[PDB]
mmCIF file of C-alpha atoms in Angstrom:
data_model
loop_
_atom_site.group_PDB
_atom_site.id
_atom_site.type_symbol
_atom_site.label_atom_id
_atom_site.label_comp_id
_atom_site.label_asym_id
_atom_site.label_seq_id
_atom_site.Cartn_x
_atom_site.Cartn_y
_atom_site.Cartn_z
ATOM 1 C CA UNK A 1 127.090 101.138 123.402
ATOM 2 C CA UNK A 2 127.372 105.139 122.265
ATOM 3 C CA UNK A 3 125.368 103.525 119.092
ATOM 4 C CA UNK A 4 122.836 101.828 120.793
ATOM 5 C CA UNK A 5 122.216 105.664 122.859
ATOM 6 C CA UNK A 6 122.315 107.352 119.247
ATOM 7 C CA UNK A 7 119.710 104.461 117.901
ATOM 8 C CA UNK A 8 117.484 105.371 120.770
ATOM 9 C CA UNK A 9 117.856 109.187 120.302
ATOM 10 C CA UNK A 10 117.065 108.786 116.752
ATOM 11 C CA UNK A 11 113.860 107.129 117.321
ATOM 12 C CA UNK A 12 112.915 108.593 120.209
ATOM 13 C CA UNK A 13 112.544 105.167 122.266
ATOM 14 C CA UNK A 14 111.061 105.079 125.383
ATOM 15 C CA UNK A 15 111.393 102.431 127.217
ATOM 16 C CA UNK A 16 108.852 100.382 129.651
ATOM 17 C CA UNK A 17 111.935 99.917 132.666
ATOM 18 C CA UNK A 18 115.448 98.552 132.916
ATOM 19 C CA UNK A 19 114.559 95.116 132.138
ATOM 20 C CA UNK A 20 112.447 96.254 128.530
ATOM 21 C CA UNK A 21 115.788 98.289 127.753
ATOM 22 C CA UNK A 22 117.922 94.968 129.018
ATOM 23 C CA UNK A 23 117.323 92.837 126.613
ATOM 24 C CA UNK A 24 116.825 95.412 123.384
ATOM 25 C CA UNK A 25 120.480 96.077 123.975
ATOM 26 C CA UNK A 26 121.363 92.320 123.979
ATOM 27 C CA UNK A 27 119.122 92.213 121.334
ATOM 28 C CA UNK A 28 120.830 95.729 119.380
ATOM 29 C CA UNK A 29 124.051 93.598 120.295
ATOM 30 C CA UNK A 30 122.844 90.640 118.511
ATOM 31 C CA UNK A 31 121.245 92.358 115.205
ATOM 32 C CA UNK A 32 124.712 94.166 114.618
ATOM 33 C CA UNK A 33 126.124 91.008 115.549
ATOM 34 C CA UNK A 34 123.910 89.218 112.563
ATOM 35 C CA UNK A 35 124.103 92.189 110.411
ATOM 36 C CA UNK A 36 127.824 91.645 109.890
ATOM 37 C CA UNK A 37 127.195 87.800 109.124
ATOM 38 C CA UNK A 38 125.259 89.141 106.291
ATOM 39 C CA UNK A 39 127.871 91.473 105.556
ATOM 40 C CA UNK A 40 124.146 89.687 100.572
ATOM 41 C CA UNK A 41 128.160 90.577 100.894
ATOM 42 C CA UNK A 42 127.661 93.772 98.241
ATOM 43 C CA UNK A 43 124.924 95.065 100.226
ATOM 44 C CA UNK A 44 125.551 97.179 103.118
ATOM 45 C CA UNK A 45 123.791 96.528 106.686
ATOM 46 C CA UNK A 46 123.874 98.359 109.645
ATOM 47 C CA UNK A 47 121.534 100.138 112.574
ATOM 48 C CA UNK A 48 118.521 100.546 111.148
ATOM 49 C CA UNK A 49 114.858 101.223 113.086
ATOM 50 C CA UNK A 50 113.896 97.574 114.406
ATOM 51 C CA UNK A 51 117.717 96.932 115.389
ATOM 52 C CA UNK A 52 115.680 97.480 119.181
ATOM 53 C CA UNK A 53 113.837 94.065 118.293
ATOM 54 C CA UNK A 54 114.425 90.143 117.698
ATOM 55 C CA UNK A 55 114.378 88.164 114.756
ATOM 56 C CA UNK A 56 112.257 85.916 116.799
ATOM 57 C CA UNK A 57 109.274 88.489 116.685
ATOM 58 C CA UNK A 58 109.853 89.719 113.311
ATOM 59 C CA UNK A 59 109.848 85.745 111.966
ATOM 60 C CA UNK A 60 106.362 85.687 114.289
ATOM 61 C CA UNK A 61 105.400 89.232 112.618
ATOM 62 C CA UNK A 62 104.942 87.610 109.292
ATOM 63 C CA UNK A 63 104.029 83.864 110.549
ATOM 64 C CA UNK A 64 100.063 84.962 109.283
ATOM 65 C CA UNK A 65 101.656 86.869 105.735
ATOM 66 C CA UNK A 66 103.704 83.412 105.376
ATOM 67 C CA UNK A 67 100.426 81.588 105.475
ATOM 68 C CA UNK A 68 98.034 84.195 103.223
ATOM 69 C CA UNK A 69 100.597 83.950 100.416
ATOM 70 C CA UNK A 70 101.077 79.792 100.781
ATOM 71 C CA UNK A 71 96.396 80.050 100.640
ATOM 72 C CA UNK A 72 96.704 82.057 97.354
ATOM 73 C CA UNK A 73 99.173 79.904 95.733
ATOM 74 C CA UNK A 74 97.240 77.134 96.401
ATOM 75 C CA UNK A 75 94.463 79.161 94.394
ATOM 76 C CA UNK A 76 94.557 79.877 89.943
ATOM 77 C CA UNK A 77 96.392 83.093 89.400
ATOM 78 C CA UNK A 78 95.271 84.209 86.343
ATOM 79 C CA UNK A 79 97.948 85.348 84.380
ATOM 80 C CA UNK A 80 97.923 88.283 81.793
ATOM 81 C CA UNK A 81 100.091 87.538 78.697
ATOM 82 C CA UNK A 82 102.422 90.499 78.400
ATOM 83 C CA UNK A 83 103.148 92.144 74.701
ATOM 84 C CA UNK A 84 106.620 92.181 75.173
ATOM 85 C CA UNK A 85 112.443 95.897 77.623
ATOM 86 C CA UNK A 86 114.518 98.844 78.163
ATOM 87 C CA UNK A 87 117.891 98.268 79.869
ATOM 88 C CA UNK A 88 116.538 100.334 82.914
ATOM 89 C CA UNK A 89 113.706 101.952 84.022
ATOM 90 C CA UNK A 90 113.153 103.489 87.711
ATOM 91 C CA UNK A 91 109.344 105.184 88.004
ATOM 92 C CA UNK A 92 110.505 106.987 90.909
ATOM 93 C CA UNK A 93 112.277 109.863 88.391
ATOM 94 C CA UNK A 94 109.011 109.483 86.413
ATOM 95 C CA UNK A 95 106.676 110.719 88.864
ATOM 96 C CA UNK A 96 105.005 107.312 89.206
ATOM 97 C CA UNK A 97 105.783 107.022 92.778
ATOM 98 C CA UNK A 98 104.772 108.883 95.872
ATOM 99 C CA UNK A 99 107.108 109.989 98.960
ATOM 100 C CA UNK A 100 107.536 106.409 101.009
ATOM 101 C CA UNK A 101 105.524 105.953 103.773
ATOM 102 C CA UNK A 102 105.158 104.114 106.980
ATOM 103 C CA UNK A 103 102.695 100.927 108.093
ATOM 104 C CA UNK A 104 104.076 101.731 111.615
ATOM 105 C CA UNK A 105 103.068 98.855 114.245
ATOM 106 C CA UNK A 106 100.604 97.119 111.927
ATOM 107 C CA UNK A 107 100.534 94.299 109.504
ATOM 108 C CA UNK A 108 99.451 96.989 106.998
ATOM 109 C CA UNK A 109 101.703 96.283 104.148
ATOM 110 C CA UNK A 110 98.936 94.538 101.869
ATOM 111 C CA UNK A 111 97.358 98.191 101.662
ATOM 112 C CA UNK A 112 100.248 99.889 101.128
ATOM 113 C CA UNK A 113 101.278 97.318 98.276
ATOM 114 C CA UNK A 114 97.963 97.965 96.498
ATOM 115 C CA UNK A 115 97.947 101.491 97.167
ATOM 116 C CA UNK A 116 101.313 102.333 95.585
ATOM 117 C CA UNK A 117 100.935 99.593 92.991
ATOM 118 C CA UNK A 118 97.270 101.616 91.916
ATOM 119 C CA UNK A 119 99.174 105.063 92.269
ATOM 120 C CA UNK A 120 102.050 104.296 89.774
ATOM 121 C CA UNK A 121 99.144 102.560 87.379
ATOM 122 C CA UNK A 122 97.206 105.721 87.666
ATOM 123 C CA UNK A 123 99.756 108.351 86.979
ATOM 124 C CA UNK A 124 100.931 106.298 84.045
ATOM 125 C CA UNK A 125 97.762 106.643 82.474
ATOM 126 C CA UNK A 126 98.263 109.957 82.540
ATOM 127 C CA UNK A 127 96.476 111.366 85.182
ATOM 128 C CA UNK A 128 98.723 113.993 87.807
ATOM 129 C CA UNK A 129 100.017 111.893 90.416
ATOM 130 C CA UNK A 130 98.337 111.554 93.657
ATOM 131 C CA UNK A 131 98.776 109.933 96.629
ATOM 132 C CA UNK A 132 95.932 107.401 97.658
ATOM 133 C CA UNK A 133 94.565 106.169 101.270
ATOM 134 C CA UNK A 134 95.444 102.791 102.285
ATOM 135 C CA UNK A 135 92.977 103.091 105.549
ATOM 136 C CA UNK A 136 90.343 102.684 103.518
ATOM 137 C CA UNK A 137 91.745 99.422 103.034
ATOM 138 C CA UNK A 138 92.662 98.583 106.378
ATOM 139 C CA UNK A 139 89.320 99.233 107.810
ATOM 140 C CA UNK A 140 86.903 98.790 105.033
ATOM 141 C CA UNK A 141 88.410 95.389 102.910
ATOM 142 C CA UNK A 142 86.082 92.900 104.692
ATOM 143 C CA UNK A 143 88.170 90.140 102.839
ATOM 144 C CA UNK A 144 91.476 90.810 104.346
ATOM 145 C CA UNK A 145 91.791 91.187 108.014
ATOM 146 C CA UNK A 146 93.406 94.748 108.664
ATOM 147 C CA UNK A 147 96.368 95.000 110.805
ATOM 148 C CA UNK A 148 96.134 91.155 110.963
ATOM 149 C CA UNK A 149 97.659 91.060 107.424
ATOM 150 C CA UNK A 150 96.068 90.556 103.903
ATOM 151 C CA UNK A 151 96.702 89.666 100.045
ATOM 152 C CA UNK A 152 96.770 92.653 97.456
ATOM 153 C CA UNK A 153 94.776 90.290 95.278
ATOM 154 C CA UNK A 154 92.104 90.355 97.985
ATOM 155 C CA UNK A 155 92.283 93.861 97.862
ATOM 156 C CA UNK A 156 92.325 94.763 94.644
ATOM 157 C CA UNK A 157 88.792 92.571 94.089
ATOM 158 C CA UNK A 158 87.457 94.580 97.339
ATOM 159 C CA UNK A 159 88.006 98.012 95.441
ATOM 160 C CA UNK A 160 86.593 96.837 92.128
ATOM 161 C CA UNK A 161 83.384 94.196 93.698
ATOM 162 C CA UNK A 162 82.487 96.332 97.006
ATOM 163 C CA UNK A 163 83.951 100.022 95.874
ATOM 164 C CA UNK A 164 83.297 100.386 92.387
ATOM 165 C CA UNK A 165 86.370 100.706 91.477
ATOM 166 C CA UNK A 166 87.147 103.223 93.516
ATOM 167 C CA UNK A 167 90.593 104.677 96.027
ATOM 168 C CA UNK A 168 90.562 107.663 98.505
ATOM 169 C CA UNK A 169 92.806 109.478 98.926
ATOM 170 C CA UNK A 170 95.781 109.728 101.350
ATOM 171 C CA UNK A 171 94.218 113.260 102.231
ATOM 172 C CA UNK A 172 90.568 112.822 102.845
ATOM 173 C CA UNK A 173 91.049 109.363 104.610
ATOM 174 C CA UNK A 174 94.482 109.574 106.515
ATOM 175 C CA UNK A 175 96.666 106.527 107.804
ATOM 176 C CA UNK A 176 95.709 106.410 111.359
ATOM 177 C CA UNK A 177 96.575 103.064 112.108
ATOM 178 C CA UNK A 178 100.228 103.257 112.708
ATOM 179 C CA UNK A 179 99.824 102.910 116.602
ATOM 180 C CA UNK A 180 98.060 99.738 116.293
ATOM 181 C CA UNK A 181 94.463 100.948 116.584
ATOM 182 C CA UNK A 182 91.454 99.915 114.406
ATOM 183 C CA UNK A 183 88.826 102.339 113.749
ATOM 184 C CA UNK A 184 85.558 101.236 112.027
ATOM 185 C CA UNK A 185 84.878 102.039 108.576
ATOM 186 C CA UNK A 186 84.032 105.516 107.508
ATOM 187 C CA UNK A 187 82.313 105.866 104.029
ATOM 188 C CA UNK A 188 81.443 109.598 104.316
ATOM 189 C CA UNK A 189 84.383 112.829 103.760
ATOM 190 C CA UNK A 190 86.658 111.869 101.012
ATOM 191 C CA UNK A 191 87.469 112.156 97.794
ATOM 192 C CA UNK A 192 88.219 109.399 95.731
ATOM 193 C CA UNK A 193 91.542 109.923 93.944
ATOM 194 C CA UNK A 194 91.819 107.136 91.713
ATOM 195 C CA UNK A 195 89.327 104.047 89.624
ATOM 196 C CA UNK A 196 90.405 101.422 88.760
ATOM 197 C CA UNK A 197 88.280 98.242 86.141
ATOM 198 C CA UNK A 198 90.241 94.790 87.242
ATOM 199 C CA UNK A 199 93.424 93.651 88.384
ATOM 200 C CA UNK A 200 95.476 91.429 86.902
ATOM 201 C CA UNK A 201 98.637 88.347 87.681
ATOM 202 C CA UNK A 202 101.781 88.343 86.366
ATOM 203 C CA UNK A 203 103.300 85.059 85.505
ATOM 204 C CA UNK A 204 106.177 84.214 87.474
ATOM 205 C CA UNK A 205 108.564 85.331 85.003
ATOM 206 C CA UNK A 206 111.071 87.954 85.786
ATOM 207 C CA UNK A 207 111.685 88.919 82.138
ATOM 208 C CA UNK A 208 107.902 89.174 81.687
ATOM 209 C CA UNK A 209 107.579 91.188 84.851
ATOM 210 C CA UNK A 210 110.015 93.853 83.620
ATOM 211 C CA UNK A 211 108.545 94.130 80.733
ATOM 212 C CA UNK A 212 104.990 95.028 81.632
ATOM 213 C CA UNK A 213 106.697 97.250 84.747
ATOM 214 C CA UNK A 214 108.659 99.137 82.018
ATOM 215 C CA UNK A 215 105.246 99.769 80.157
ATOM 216 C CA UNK A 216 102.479 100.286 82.438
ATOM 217 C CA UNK A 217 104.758 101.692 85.991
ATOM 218 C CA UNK A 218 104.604 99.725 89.246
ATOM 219 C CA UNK A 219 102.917 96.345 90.365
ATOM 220 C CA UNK A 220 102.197 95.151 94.031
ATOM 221 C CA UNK A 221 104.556 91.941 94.289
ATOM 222 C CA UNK A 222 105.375 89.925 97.561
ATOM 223 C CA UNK A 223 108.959 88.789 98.745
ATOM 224 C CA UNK A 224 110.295 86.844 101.767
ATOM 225 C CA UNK A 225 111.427 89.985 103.878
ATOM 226 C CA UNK A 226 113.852 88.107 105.781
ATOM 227 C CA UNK A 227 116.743 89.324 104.918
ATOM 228 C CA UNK A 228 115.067 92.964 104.627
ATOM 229 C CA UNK A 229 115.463 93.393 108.305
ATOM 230 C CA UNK A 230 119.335 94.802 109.218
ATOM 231 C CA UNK A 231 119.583 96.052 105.863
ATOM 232 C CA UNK A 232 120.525 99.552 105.436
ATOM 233 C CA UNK A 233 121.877 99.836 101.394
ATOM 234 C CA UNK A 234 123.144 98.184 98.928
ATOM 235 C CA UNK A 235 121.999 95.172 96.373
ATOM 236 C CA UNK A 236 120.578 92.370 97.853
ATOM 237 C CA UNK A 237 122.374 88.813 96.092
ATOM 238 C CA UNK A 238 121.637 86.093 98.821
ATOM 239 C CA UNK A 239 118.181 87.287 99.937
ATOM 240 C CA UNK A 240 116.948 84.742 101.889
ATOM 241 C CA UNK A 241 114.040 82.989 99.520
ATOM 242 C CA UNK A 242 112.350 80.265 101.118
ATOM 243 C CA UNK A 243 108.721 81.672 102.623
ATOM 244 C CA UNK A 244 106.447 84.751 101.008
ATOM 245 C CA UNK A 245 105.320 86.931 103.664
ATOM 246 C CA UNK A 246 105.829 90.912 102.869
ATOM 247 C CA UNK A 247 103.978 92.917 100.360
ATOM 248 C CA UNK A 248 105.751 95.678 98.532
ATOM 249 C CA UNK A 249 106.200 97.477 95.365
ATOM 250 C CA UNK A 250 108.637 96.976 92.214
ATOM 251 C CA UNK A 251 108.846 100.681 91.182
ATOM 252 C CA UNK A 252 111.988 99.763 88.645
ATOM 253 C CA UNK A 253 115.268 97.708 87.777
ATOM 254 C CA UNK A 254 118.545 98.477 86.048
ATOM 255 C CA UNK A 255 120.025 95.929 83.397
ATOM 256 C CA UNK A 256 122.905 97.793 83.138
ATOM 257 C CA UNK A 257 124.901 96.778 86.339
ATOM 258 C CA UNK A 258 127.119 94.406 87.958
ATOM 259 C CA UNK A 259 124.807 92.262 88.575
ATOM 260 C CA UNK A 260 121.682 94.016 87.624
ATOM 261 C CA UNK A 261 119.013 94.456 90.205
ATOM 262 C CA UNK A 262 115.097 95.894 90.867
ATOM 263 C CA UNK A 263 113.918 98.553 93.238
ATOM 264 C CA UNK A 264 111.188 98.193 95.526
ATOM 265 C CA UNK A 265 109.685 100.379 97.580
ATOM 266 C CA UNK A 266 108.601 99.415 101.188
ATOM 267 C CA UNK A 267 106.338 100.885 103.604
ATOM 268 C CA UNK A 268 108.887 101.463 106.633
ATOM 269 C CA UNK A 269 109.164 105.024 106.093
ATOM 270 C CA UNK A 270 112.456 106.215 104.406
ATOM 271 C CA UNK A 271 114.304 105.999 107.854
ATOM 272 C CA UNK A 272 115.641 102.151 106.413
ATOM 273 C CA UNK A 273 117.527 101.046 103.739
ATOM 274 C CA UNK A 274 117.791 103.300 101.112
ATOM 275 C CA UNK A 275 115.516 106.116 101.818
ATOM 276 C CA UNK A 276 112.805 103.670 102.256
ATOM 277 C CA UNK A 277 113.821 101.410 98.883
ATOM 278 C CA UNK A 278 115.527 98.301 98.361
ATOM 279 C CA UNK A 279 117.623 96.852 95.533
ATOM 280 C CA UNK A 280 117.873 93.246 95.183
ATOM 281 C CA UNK A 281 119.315 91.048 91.937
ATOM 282 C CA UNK A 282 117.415 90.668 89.267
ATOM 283 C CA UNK A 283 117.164 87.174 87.485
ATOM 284 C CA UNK A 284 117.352 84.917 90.280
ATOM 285 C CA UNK A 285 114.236 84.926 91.401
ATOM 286 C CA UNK A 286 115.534 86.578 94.774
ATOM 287 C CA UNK A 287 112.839 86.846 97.757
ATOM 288 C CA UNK A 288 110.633 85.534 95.203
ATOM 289 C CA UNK A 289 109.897 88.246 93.967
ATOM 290 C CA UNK A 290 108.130 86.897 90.849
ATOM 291 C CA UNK A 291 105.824 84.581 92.514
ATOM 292 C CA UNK A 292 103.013 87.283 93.488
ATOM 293 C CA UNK A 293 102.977 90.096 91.478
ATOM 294 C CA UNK A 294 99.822 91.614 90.479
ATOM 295 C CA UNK A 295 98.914 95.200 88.926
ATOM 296 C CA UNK A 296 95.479 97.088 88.979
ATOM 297 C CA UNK A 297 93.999 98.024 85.299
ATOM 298 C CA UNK A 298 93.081 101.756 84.456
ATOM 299 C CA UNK A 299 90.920 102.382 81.548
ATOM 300 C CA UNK A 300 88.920 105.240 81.344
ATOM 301 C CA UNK A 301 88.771 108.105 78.612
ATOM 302 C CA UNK A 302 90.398 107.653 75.173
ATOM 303 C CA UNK A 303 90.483 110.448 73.720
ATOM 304 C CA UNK A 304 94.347 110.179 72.497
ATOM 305 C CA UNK A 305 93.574 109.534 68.497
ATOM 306 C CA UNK A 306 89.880 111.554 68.828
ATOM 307 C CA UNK A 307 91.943 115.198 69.680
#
């Protein structure tokens, strides 16, 4: 119970009365108690900052991604044929991926998907890295539904069809929709830090996946986050894989291990898992991961063989 005192005191939570706190204790008691069922078995799990709440909530936090993801299947996915695979490759070392950030109490992750996925395609262009605004999103993407969830493929066509291809950035339009709130759509005071032509699919090939990660940096995919919940390190090897309903961001994998695995990026700060980042096995098809995984195009100047 010292644990569940330090887990409060490291999140600063506040609770309503005795009764709220009641029941997130049982509740503590019964993540750790799950977390050590789970004990993926060379993965570790542990306290991490939703250990206050119930899998029953979580399950009903996704119950609208769950049913996005099953609409778009149902929809042609376009798939890209890719050229055609290093061993490993991990963008983060590359400066292809931003400091990990946090969609706080809203069903953000969509944005933050696209927005990473469009700041790893951008820098590997060759343009200095810079992080991007996923507000912008969340209040002006009249396809997706803010806080209420989204599709990064619904994004990516808002950007290109009602933006011109164009991202703000993290600076001139700020994430202010952690606590919940909704503002309405401000057009005016920022710079735009990226453009961006079309998006494209992936097919649902893990091999393929890897290879066009390897060459053009990170892509927006969609996994079950399930099992993401008690996690705190480790490689994932019996994600649960049964229902899409999280967006996040392959920013690498690693061929070279036992077993070999990718690395995502999430958007619950860095306080969980592994500074923010996951690691689950590659070649299984685990959290199924292959099934939506899109990447926005960057074109622009050529220059290269005319200087």
């Amino acid at each position: 119970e010292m644990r569940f005192a330090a887990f409060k005191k490291k999140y600063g939570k506040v609770y309503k009365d005795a009764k709220e706190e009641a029941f997130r204790f049982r509740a503590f008691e019964e993540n750790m108690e799950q977390a050590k069922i789970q004990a993926n078995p060379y993965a570790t799990f542990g306290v991490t900052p939703f250990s206050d709440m119930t899998r029953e909530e979580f399950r009903a936090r996704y119950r609208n991604g769950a049913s996005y993801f099953a609409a778009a299947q149902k929809r042609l996915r376009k798939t890209v044929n890719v050229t055609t695979a290093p061993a490993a490759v991990d963008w983060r070392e590359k400066g292809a991926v931003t400091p990990v950030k946090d969609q706080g109490q809203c069903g953000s992750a969509w944005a933050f998907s696209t927005i990473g996925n469009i700041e790893g395609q951008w820098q590997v262009a060759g343009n200095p890295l810079v992080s991007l605004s996923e507000q912008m999103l969340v209040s002006c993407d009249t396809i997706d539904f803010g806080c209420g969830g989204g599709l990064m493929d619904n994004a990516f066509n808002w950007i290109v069809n009602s933006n011109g291809g164009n991202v703000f950035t993290e600076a001139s339009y700020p994430y202010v929709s952690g606590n919940g709130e909704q503002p309405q759509c401000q057009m005016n005071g920022h710079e735009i830090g990226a453009a961006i032509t079309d998006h494209v699919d992936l097919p649902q090939d893990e091999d393929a996946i890897a290879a066009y990660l390897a060459e053009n940096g990170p892509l927006a995919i969609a996994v079950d986050a399930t099992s993401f919940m008690d996690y705190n390190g480790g490689i994932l090897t019996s994600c649960t894989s049964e229902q899409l309903d999280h967006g996040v961001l392959l920013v690498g994998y690693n061929d070279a291990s036992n077993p070999p695995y990718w690395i995502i990026k999430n958007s619950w700060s860095n306080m969980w898992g592994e500074d923010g980042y996951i690691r689950i096995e590659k070649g299984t098809n685990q959290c199924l991961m292959n099934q939506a995984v899109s990447s926005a195009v960057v074109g622009g100047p050529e220059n290269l063989y005319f200087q």
